[PDB]
Design a protein around this ligand. Sequence first.
Ligand code: SRM
Ligand code: SRM
Ligand code: SRM
Ligand code: SRM
Ligand code: SF4
Ligand code: SF4
Ligand code: SF4
Ligand code: SF4
Ligand code: SF4
Ligand code: SF4
Ligand code: SF4
Ligand code: SF4
Ligand SMILES: [S]
Lengths: 363, 363, 417, 417
Amino acid sequence: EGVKTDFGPPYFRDLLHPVIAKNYGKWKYHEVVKPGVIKRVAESGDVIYVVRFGTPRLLSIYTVRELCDIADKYSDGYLRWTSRNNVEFFVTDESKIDDLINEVQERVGFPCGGTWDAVKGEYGLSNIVHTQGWIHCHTPAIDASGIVKAVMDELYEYFTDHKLPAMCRISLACCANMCGAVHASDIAIVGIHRTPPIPNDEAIRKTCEIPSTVAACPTGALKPDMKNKTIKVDVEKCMYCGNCYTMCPGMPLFDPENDGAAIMVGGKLSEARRMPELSKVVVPWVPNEPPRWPTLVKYVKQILEAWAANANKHERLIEWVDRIGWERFFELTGLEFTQHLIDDYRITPYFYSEFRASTQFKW
Amino acid sequence: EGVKTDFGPPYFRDLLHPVIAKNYGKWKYHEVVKPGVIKRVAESGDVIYVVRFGTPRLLSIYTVRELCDIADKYSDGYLRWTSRNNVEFFVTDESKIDDLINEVQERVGFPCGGTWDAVKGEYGLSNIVHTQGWIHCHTPAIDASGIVKAVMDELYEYFTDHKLPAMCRISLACCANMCGAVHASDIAIVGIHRTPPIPNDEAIRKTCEIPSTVAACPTGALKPDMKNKTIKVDVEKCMYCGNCYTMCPGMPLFDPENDGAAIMVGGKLSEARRMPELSKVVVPWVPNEPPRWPTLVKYVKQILEAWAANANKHERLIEWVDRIGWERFFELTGLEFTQHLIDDYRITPYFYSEFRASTQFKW
Amino acid sequence: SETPLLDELEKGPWPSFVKEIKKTAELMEKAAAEGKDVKMPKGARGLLKQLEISYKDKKTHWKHGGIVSVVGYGGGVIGRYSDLGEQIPEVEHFHTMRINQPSGWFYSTKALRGLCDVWEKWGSGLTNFHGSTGDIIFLGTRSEYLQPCFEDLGNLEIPFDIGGSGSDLRTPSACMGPALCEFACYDTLELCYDLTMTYQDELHRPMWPYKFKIKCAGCPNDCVASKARSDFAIIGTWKDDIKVDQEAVKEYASWMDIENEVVKLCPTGAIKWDGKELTIDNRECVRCMHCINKMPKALKPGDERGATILIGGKAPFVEGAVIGWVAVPFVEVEKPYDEIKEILEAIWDWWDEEGKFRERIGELIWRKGMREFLKVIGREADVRMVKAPRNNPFMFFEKDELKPSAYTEELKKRGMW
Amino acid sequence: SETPLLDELEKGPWPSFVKEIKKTAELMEKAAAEGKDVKMPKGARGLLKQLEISYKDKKTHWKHGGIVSVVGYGGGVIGRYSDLGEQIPEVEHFHTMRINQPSGWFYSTKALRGLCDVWEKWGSGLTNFHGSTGDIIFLGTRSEYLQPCFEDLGNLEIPFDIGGSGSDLRTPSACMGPALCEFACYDTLELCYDLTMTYQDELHRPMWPYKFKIKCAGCPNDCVASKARSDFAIIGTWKDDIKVDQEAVKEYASWMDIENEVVKLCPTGAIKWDGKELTIDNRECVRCMHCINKMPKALKPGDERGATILIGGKAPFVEGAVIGWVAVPFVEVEKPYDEIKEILEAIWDWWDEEGKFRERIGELIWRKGMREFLKVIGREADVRMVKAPRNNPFMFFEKDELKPSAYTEELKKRGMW
Ligand code: SRM
Ligand code: SRM
Ligand code: SRM
Ligand code: SRM
Ligand code: SF4
Ligand code: SF4
Ligand code: SF4
Ligand code: SF4
Ligand code: SF4
Ligand code: SF4
Ligand code: SF4
Ligand code: SF4
Ligand SMILES: [S]
């Protein structure tokens, strides 16, 4: 007896819809019926329908109850989530699709959409990759679920209709730890501090490991005192990364009035047409404005829209910019260049720019 | 009186040809008549022909006297050098061009040529910019003058006619200080060492300032040896760059069996068509083998010709590589790719790659 | 009202997390009234209030969590304490539990229902579906309910193990792959489970100088963001001809501008459309996928399949954010995946020896050089590894590459060899 | 032969440097045996002897020289001493004198004959035309002869001063520019001469952290390699439209494939040609020069002329090679060039103050940052300074951009802000 361990997650193969199990690894072609429903013929011609739905990621167990009950109807009791946190469903009867849509709409209240098709070339907004934020995180400069809800309020109409010329992902990290693909997305929200730490010297003297704290700082901004036994900080050197707060309890840098979000732009992870790209900062700072965060959400469309309008079919944001240049962009999206946006992050090496950060090469 | 100082150079305007002085900044067009002969027509209708000649750059004052006797007779007392060390005479009477050309080859033995014509897209190879080598310098890995002679013998055909589809600059540095624009040249030859220095403590103690010697090492492979008032070198870290020997004569690292030349490609200075680019090493090392350097010459020759044979009009080496990629480059050139060619020089900032190293931008 | 700011976000068309929280509030509190076995029916209101202060306060109300483990494991539990501890007693210890999701995030209802069973009984009722790394998140329970919950989890008809955290192997993730994609060059879902089982000890009991993340993508679309998120991203690919069917490709040309939308959009100009034939020169193709994305029916990934391994993918700290770079151009993806494992094992042997405390694999490669990295994995250098040869002559040479000379003997003589 | 390895390089079409050394040897030896005042009849013969040995040993026989120079200057004269002084006394000292070239290397014969007279008398009789920066190299003389060489230099009919060397302003150089070239955007030769004259003091008398170089090109073709081989590249440009002559464009069209060789090659797609009219979208033009290069009878740089300043270029040591980057997108270039000089002087004051021993301007800017760089030259950040904005959010902010808060207040009172 005595508590079993190391048994791993369940075997996936057991928990696949029966049509999906039989036709595993043997499919002909995919097809997007409308906003939200993707059809998929087998090789035999077994027809399955993946029907996508946005979730607020965080969920009550009673929201998990309801979906299951919805699933036990339309999808033989089977379902999955997606990489961008969307719930999926497997209807085998095509005349039973539209019904399902409402059932979800009424009960837990999830929309239908989150898809996009390269074929016709009509892309649309998927969900935003985010995380715990003020709900459960001790190092956020911003809140995720909140800054999400707002963005998908103003850009709702986008999730449930294929109106964008090319794939756009928006994403959010709540501090510069940058959990998730915030470093490589089409439009990114990043929590940043703006204030140096006022060290709790009486909290360091007991809790922390100083040499491992001091060395953790990217710019050598941290040096120890031997007396004393308390870290000093050169303000001429801290760019407020908040990493030493991740290390050491009493290195706090929360300014409620100055912590906020930067807007990155230009990221990309896929290979199609052009090689992947790390996002680029375009708006240096916008404030936390609970609960509706109007500055941020406005700038997200003072950015998405200016691209949306001007872009060709398939041309994502960084692909737009290589065509027009960073000159035009900044004028077109109504933005300001400041010296804040000349990269000055000294430690990263030139030699990485010469490595193949891509699967794109010839045999 | 008292010795005259601080009068600088003779004012160029006193030393120009009269036709040049009058049409100063008043030109209609240039036109490449034939290899080494450029017709320049002023708005005044004055025609002048600038006639170009290869030189060994190292000149005998008795040669310069020969050039002067020649300038008096064909060019009214005037001549110029070029930024690639070719020499140029001015002729007004076009029934005289060929006499000059023939008198110059005769008397001093310098070939007319070094020109190119973007209009027709037919290019010649010009002089090799090089430095002092064993003639004068105390820090060289290779000889400048011998490599330049042995290379030019072989490519002579290309200095006298327009046999190339695009510009190709060959440049040579006797060591890694470069003393020229080798680092931005279609084909660069760069001497290197492959052996770390042996500290001669006694010469170090006598002649070397330690802290500045130490801070001159880009890898941090030098440390001060306090109790022996000298310098300790960590070999695992040394890449034989030589800098510390420039700094301190106690630190020499010459090895006649192991010093040789890198071959680099794909540098570009002009903006025409494509941005400027630094050269990229494609052959790690070849021996010195005076007086002819056959191995090194064989590879310069094999690189040029692969490019020339497969290049489109205007397409310089880096613009060739831009089209075909490096995989096909190494194949076509028949070079080998090894781990030496993976950049590992760590001190250079990523952020320099984000900077606009060029004059190309929209207004 | 009690939660003025948080209630305004209960408005709108996107589904609210607040009516997810409030549903968790009033229905967990119903169970307690109804006489159901629920240890923290308090966890979810206290979570709403604390967040209310944080909205007005515009800053967090969680302080550093102290190491709280589940017996046997060190990895699996992210402990979190609350600074408004006495203001809201129910959230003194609101620790997350990362539970290993089945690869591809596929579930039967039973699986989810039994999972809803335990977290109701032993937690706050709040979940994440799904976490960024891929784990099902159980958001907030006390330190005394960690071990009983994991016991019930190992006692469900459909059992779920704890996932990863700390300086360990995290929970590997995989795109839907062969299950629902026809682009998949290999069975992402099976190699996910396998690796997840093979290194259970590596996942549960942190032994490394830092974290290590693997993800698996079935074709260069990178649908689980693996080259931005995982240190070691398996990104499926092929080596031979992209299979074309000229029937469907005709059909397409009835309505789809292939010239402006395919031919001209290919990054190397490999693909051409004639009006009748589609020629692919696979020699100049880069497997960008765009041409199979544009014609799903008529174009498939080549017969000879495998993967490209990208190393170093990681977020910013310390020395800058990374998109994984080419480590092994092609490795074959074959049960039991011994070649894939040999690489990882070799890497961790090397990374456990040479890594500084808190040093991601990518930074150490930068620190140590690719020659040493390739040495470890036993791979030669390949031009494909780089976007261009180095732009400086500052090369290291190995002892045994030099011509023997008076100078080298001098080096040997002083023991500087 | 006395010199059999060098004899080999008397062979082959290309003019021989060995022939130049030998020629000097013979005729310096003839002049001096036939009555002439020649101080070093054997200079050239010693150097070729030493150069033969260097070829045989495959290594230099020069060594770290000593400091040396003319009375009044602390630069322009490089001491070099031979490690074979014993065997070959005539090369025991063999210093170089760097003599300041005329703008764009333009000579009359009388000017050249003066130098030859002066060098024959006091030195080896060997030269470089030209040193890489631009200077005439007097190659080989003893310490005793330096000042008397200079006195004669100063006294000739057309006199030549010493160039630069060391941690000074070096000898600036220019492309031919308006003396011959119809693409020129400013007067390269005039500027260069005037900067040389304005800063004789900074040039003759090393004062700075390390060396500084200015080079002037009349348009972006940049035919003096300024962005690679000067710290301050002044590269001419324009703001308005490219002037186009259509009669002229048509005459190209009868024979030149403009579509392929011009239209397709434009980096920015800004130039159309339909069969009867050429159309440059000047808003999309980058001034790369290709279209004008191709069509010089038909297209000229536009009327609003000036220069882009490019900052920092250098060979590798210590922190890597640089092609200078956009510092000032456009500055007017007009006599007396007060605008350029104010940027130079501000930089020099800054660099003199903040630079490390043997740190280059480009490197200093990499260490202190561009905002400080820009504040120094009193100019504003501009998107044209970057090829891309930052790939990380770790930005510094000014104390004045910062919002008033309890925090800001609490750190003023801590001695930190
Ligand atoms: C649902 C999901 C599978 C999963 O959960 O395992 C998915 C599914 C498909 N992706 Fe994807 N992709 C999924 C993550 C992604 C994301 C990854 C991410 O955001 O984390 C992108 C890469 C993001 C990036 O590049 O920044 C992605 C890269 C692609 C590419 C896009 C290339 C492009 O730049 O346009 C193709 C697009 C296409 O088919 O036209 C693609 C195509 C597809 C196809 C069409 C392939 C097929 O034949 O089935 C799948 C149908 C979805 C659709 O709406 O067209 N999928 N795909 C993904 C989860 C996200 C979601 O819920 O929407
Ligand atoms: C004479 C000289 C200036 C001087 O004061 O010494 C010069 C003069 C001209 N250059 Fe240059 N360039 C001269 C060195 C350069 C160099 C600088 C160097 O090599 O160190 C390059 C920059 C190198 C690089 O880009 O790597 C240079 C890049 C150009 C460009 C670039 C062509 C391209 O395809 O990128 C133009 C365009 C052209 O080809 O007509 C150009 C064109 C010209 C034109 C045609 C312009 C004109 O209206 O007359 C001039 C005649 C050149 C010809 O042969 O047709 N010149 N030009 C240069 C002496 C070189 C020699 O003796 O061989
Ligand atoms: C004379 C000249 C070579 C030639 O034969 O033409 C020269 C020769 C020497 N150079 Fe240079 N450099 C010459 C132009 C250059 C140039 C390019 C230019 O000026 O156009 C550069 C690259 C741009 C730059 O300076 O950054 C150049 C970059 C260097 C480097 C340092 C660059 C760096 O990485 O920071 C070394 C080492 C140093 O200065 O510390 C150096 C140092 C030297 C030393 C003093 C050797 C040493 O290691 O201490 C040279 C002595 C030769 C001798 O005693 O006879 N030389 N050197 C060149 C100038 C003559 C003239 O005035 O016209
Ligand atoms: C659990 C999760 C949020 C969520 O619930 O969605 C998370 C949350 C935390 N992350 Fe993370 N990270 C989460 C995925 C990531 C990812 C993405 C991934 O792994 O797929 C990254 C970037 C990818 C990577 O690093 O390879 C990420 C990069 C970080 C950073 C930066 C790491 C670095 O290289 O510098 C810190 C690192 C640290 O622990 O110091 C961090 C550390 C943390 C800590 C332990 C906070 C801290 O600094 O002490 C987090 C505790 C949770 C909390 O608030 O109580 N987290 N973090 C994410 C995992 C979900 C899941 O398991 O399903
Ligand atoms: S990005 Fe920052 S605030 Fe968000 S979950 Fe990660 S550590 Fe917490
Ligand atoms: S905020 Fe960042 S840069 Fe400043 S002391 Fe902390 S770790 Fe260093
Ligand atoms: S490149 Fe090197 S060897 Fe050549 S002259 Fe310059 S410093 Fe001396
Ligand atoms: S030779 Fe170069 S890398 Fe080696 S110790 Fe000297 S400066 Fe350092
Ligand atoms: S990564 Fe490729 S195989 Fe996997 S889900 Fe995306 S498109 Fe399909
Ligand atoms: S996969 Fe991409 S690169 Fe290859 S042929 Fe198709 S479009 Fe071209
Ligand atoms: S830089 Fe321009 S102006 Fe000067 S020579 Fe070259 S083409 Fe003529
Ligand atoms: S100058 Fe260059 S970018 Fe401008 S029109 Fe001519 S070719 Fe095009
Ligand atoms: S120099």
